Amino acid sequence: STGSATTTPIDSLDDAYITPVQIGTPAQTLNLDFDTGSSDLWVFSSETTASEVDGQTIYTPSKSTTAKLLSGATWSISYGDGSSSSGDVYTDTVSVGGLTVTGQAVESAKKVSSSFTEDSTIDGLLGLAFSTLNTVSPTQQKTFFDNAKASLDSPVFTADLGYHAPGTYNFGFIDTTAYTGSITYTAVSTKQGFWEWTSTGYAVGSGTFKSTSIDGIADTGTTLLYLPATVVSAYWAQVSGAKSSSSVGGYVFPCSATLPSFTFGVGSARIVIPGDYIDFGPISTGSSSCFGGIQSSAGIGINIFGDVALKAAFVVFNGATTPTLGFASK
Secondary structure, three states: OOEEEEEEEOOOOOOOEEEEEEEOOOOEEEEEEEEOOOOOEEEOEOOOOHHHOOOOOOEOHHHOOOOEEEEEEEEEEEOOOOOEEEEEEEEEEEEEOOEEEEEEEEEEEEEEOHHHHOOOOOOEEEEOOOHHHOOOEOOOOOOHHHHHHHHOOOOEEEEEOOOOOOEEEEEOOOOOOOOOOOOEEEEOEOOOOOOEEEEEEEEEOOOOOEEEEEEEEEOOOOOOEEEOHHHHHHHHOOOOOOEEEOOOOEEEEEOOOOOOOEEEEEOOEEEEEOHHHHEEEEOOOOOOEEEEOEEEOOOOOOEEEOHHHHOOOEEEEEOOOOOEEEEEOO
16 A cells, blocks of 8 residues: 655744645544654644644544544653643544555544644644654554555555645655655664664755764654754855854844755765755844754753754655665755
8 A cells, every 4th residue: 555645834934844634424624734753643633632633634533433542542742842741541443645554543632732822723633653652641643654554555645845835744655756766765773663764965055065974853843944953053154144043042134145055975875955045034023033954952951953954855764674774866
């Protein structure tokens, strides 16, 4: 089997991408944030505290003839941005782009933190990291991809995120028309539950490539590119007037600037992020200070190849017995 679904930016900045997901019978379609940095499929629901729902579409398990309470199971998750959610668990039929999994754990939120409530465009998350990170207790549950894997034509999914445009998540096949050149594959460590890999270096603009190992994760659920402070300083030093602002929470730059590209290495291959992908717009409406799309990871504990990086590539998440990541230009 295969599946193919379009993913759409939630706003004009590409802050996140939503993908329609069919849950239950008859289908209830919710727009979920596919997140290769986490491993829970959770949804706003008829159980979510009413004051914490503000425009999201909810899953109502009592209206699904295939929903079953997973008795005794609870979940609770906290994300790297400080947001969180928790609740109980149903199993139900879940379909993405024509690919159907029966018995998928659908984690129904009883509580969500304010950042979820305040974002009416995201109805939940669909985790695509390794199932070892799934938070359901006392019986950990498998991700949608893990459940689908055995049925797929090939045990892979691909992320093809658009810049200011829709893109595609495919399951079970690699669309050879969706990229240019060849795909370069690189080793993955699953020791932390992430799609963790080592970039071979970077360049700023037309500058020389610096060969240096940068361990990080491929994370579709993170907007920006978070890299070591040395690398980030080297980038922003090429933008007149750019500076790190403690009050704003990162590097800002004059909105009048033209940003240089940023290149990262994948083995001997190179992925170029155009400068325009690094512009996240005014820090507040009408400001002439703009927020940068490359930020320091120093306070995180891990480097994160988020959407800024991934949308410059066609990315293969190869879930074979020994997982690997592939990157191609497009």
